Amino acid sequence: GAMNSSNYAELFNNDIKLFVDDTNVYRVTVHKTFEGNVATKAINGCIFTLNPKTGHLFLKIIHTSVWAGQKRLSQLAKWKTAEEVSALVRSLPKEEQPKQIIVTRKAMLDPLEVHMLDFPNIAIRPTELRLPFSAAMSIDKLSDVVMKATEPQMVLFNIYDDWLDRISSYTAFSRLTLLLRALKTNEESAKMILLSDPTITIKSYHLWPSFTDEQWITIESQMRDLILTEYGRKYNV
Amino acid sequence: MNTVPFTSAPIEVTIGIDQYSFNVKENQPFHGIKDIPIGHVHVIHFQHADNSSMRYGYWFDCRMGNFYIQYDPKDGLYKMMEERDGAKFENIVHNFKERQMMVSYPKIDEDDTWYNLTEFVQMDKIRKIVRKDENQFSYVDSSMTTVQENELSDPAHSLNYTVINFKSREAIRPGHEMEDFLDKSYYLNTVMLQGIFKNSSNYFGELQFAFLNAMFFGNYGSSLQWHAMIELICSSATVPKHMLDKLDEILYYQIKTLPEQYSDILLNERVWNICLYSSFQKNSLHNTEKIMENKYPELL
Ligand SMILES: NS(=O)(=O)c1ccc(Cl)s1
Ligand SMILES: NS(=O)(=O)c1ccc(Cl)s1
């Protein structure tokens, strides 16, 4: 059924699974009209579909043209997400199709379940984990490809860069979620932590900097402090 | 007017006949029910005094044969049977009627309740839902499961209601996933009405039969079916005006007849609030909403 802290290691077993996060599919800026009313202007979005074991990120970009002339866009966005994920599964060879898809928001369950009726063996699940995948747009190279898109497009990333050569997927996922949590709680401080040091660069084929093992421990500590910092700033503790 | 005579009443039992019921004491000189209105189906049902487990009973139509009840001490129940000797059936019945050993079906002349609850119910259709072809009458009880319940265990003792499933490939057209899930008109009109039921009368008839089974026997599967068939109409944006008007009438008399003290268990809060207040037809069921709000405002 639902995914939570008790069954956390299942994410890293050998049953293919994908996380689907739709928090960046429908994105708007709200603004005033000449007449003093309020209007929204859509901006490009993305579906964030992630194999937590391999790091493979299937970033489907949602170009603002797909909203043209549609109504009830927040509701349409969940059904558009579900359509794109089902199209993705059908495009994958059978042995690459997931055995489970975990949605990060429960509103996605019915829309995905309906789109996936052809795949009765694929289990569609919620999760109780508060995951920070909404912060994926704080990753500059992903943000950049989303805003530059002029048409619907799918871009493939490994969100763990080369980390799996050195750590397990359980540790890679924990790092990723700590980075995204920090970016979500204070984007500026998080980015400063990640890029303060000019001698550590981001390889052209990577998303995050090329930290040694020791430097990653330092980075990880600084991100915990940030989250703790912001927690105190927020709650006056 | 027709008669369902009883060989005897050997065990204490509460006997229902349509929306009526009366107590018969162990070995009381009871020999059946007379003056049953011709023209409608009927149900005669039983709850033993010593064991209220298993309400059970028989749907029948007196035009289709001569039926009597005889207790079976081996299977422990009142069994409906068919007498093909017409003459002999008339002699015994006339004896009991001359000896005033029968209760009179107690219909008030103003009262259209039973007709209103069974308007579209036909014995031939009942017999397709309840499979036992060597009898012209149909046995039902509390514990019988539906075909869908068996999909989620004896197939011969099941209620073969039409399976309705909103998250099924039948209900959802490829390429119209959102459209068909949020507006069920395709499933209602093309799949179910044109495809399976052929017309709205067969659809309403199953709906009424489901409600009656649920209320008279406490059959959960029937209750599920009744709620599903309501929700399917209420969740369709496009429904013929005459079905909506008729549906409002059907439900109104079902709600009117429901025992107040059984509402808690027989009425699905989610389905009714959705149907009356959120659905496409939220404003199309004036009579049903009014009685629901004055009779069961707690549920809402
Ligand atoms: N079936 S019959 O022998 O005519 C008859 C017997 C007992 C009845 Cl009640 S009706
Ligand atoms: N078991 S239950 O849902 O309360 C029930 C509902 C309707 C019945 Cl009839 S029995």
- Written as one string, the DSSP assignment of chain B is -EEEEBS---S-EEEEETTEEEEE-TT----EEEEEPTTS-EEEEEEESS--S--EEEEE-GGG-EEEEEEETTTTEEEEEEE--HHHHHHHHHHHHHTT-SEEP---TT--HHHHHHTT--HHHHHHHB--TT-SSEEEETTPPBHHHHH---GGGSB-PPP--TTSTTT--TT-HHHHHH-THIIIIIIIIIIIISSHHHHHHHHHHHHHHHHHH--HHHHHHHHHHHHHHHT-S---HHHHHHHHHHHHHHHHHS-GGGHHHHS-HHHHHIIIIISTTTTS-HHHHHHHHHH-SS--
Choose among A79, A113, A118: nearest Cβ to B178. A79
Residues of B in contact with A82 (CB under 8 A): 177
For residue A7, the SS3 value is coil
Are residues B169 and A117, on separate chains, in Cβ contact within 8 Å?
yes
Nearest to B186 by CA among B172, B175, B196: B172
Nearest-Cα distance to chain B for A89, in Å, is: 15
Residues of B in contact with A81 (CB under 8 A): none
> Could you say which ligand is closest to the alpha carbon of residue B267?
2
Are residues A114 and B167, on separate chains, in Cβ contact within 8 Å?
yes
Task: Give, for A101, the enclosing helix (H) or strand (E).
Answer: strand A100-103
Are residues B178 and A111, on separate chains, in Cβ contact within 8 Å?
yes
Check if the beta carbon of residue B204 is closer than 8 Å to that of residue B119.
yes
CATH topology of domain A9-163: Nucleotidyltransferase; domain 5 (3.30.420)
Q: Tell me the one-letter amino acid at B66.
A: N
What's the CA-to-centroid distance between B26 and ligand 1, angstroms?
20
d(CA A52, CA A152): 24
**Nearest C-alpha in A relative to B178:** A79
Main-chain phi, psi angles of B237, to 5 degrees: -70, -30
Q: Give, for ligand 1, the residue of B68, B71, B85 to mutate: max count of ligand atoms closer than 8 Å to Cβ.
A: B68
Choose among B167, B169, B178: nearest Cβ to A113. B167
Confirm or reject contact between B186 and chain A (CB < 8 A).
no
Task: Give, for A124, the enclosing helix (H) or strand (E).
Answer: strand A123-125
d(CA B259, CA B245): 24
Burial class (CB in 10 A: 0-12, 13-18, 19+), B156: exposed
What's the CA-to-centroid distance between B222 and ligand 2, angstroms?
9
> Could you say which ligand is closest to the alpha carbon of residue B30?
1
Are residues B177 and A76, on separate chains, in Cβ contact within 8 Å?
no
Check if the beta carbon of residue B218 is closer than 8 Å to that of residue B142.
yes
For residue A213, the SS3 value is helix
The gap from C-alpha B220 to its chain's centroid, in whole angstroms, comes to 12
Bridge-based pairing of strands A100-103 and A123-125 is parallel
Choose among A76, A83, A114: nearest Cβ to B172. A114
Per-residue buried b or exposed e for B71-90, using 16+ beta carbons within 10 Å of the residue's own CB: beeeeebbebeeeeeeeebe
Are residues B177 and A113, on separate chains, in Cβ contact within 8 Å?
no
Name the token pair of A148: 């530059």
Name the token pair of B45: 């049902």
Are residues A111 and B167, on separate chains, in Cβ contact within 8 Å?
no
Choose among A76, A83, A117: nearest Cβ to B172. A117
Check if the beta carbon of residue A133 is closer than 8 Å to that of residue A180.
yes
Nearest-Cα distance to chain A for B168, in Å, is: 7
Indicate the resolution in Å: 1.7
**Nearest C-alpha in B relative to A115:** B177
Q: How far is CA A166 from CA A55, A158, A170, A171, in A?
A: 14, 15, 12, 10
Confirm or reject contact between A87 and chain B (CB < 8 A).
no
Ligand 2 neighbours (beta carbon < 6 A): B 214, 218-220, 223, 265-266
Q: Whose CA is nearest to atom 2 of ligand 1?
A: B89
Q: Point out the ligand 1 atom lying closest to the alpha carbon of residue B88.
A: 4
- Residue intervals of chain A classified under CATH 1.20.80.40 are 164-237
Check if the beta carbon of residue A58 is closer than 8 Å to that of residue A20.
no
Calculate the dihedral angle through the C-alpha atoms of B9, B11, B16, B21, rounding to the nearest 10 degrees. 100
For this PDB entry, the determination method is X-ray
Main-chain phi, psi angles of A160, to 5 degrees: -100, 10
What DSSP character marks residue A95? G
Length of chain B: 300
Nearest to B138 by CA among B157, B120, B115, B153: B157
- Residue intervals of chain A classified under CATH 3.30.420.230 are 9-163
Residues of A in contact with B169 (CB under 8 A): 117-118
Check if the beta carbon of residue B129 is closer than 8 Å to that of residue B206.
yes
Nearest to B143 by CA among B15, B24, B266, B57: B57
The most distant pair of C-alpha atoms in chain A lies apart, rounded to whole Å, by: 59
Q: What is the DSSP string of A125-194?
A: E-B-S---GGGGGGSHHHHHHHHH-SS-EEEEEETTTTGGGTS-HHHHHHHHHHHHHHHHH-HHHHHHHH
Task: Give, for A219, the enclosing helix (H) or strand (E).
Answer: helix A213-235
Are residues B167 and A117, on separate chains, in Cβ contact within 8 Å?
yes
Nearest to A16 by CA among A89, A107, A118: A89
Q: Whose CA is nearest to atom 5 of ligand 2?
A: B220
Long-range CB pairs of A66-69, under 8 A, 24+ apart, other chains included: A66/A152, A67/A26, A67/A42
Q: How far is CA B163 from CA A89, A208, B160, B206, B229, in A?
A: 29, 53, 8, 11, 10
Roughly what angle, to the nearest 10 degrees, separates helices B200-217 and B241-257? Answer: 10
Q: Tell me the one-letter amino acid at B165.
A: N
> Could you say which ligand is closest to the alpha carbon of residue B266?
2
d(CA B215, CA B255): 11
d(CA A158, CA A165): 13
Confirm or reject contact between A83 and chain B (CB < 8 A).
yes
Name the token pair of A204: 């052209």
Q: Whose CA is nearest to atom 4 of ligand 2?
A: B265
Q: How far is CA B9 from CA B16, B98, B143, in A?
A: 14, 19, 24
Burial class (CB in 10 A: 0-12, 13-18, 19+), A36: exposed
Q: Whose CA is nearest to atom 1 of ligand 2?
A: B220
Nearest to A48 by CA among A175, A111, A129, A136: A136
Nearest-Cα distance to chain B for A174, in Å, is: 35
Residues of A in contact with B181 (CB under 8 A): 110-111, 114
Q: Whose CA is nearest to atom 4 of ligand 1?
A: B89
Long-range CB pairs of A108-111, under 8 A, 24+ apart, other chains included: A108/A20, A108/A22, A108/A78, A108/A81, A108/A82, A110/B167, A110/B181, A111/A78, A111/A79, A111/A81, A111/A82, A111/B177, A111/B178, A111/B181
Check if the beta carbon of residue B24 is closer than 8 Å to that of residue B30.
yes
CATH of domain A164-237: 1.20.80.40
Window 95-124 of A, Cβ < 8 Å to B: 110-111, 113-115, 117-118
Bridge-based pairing of strands B2-5 and B32-36 is antiparallel
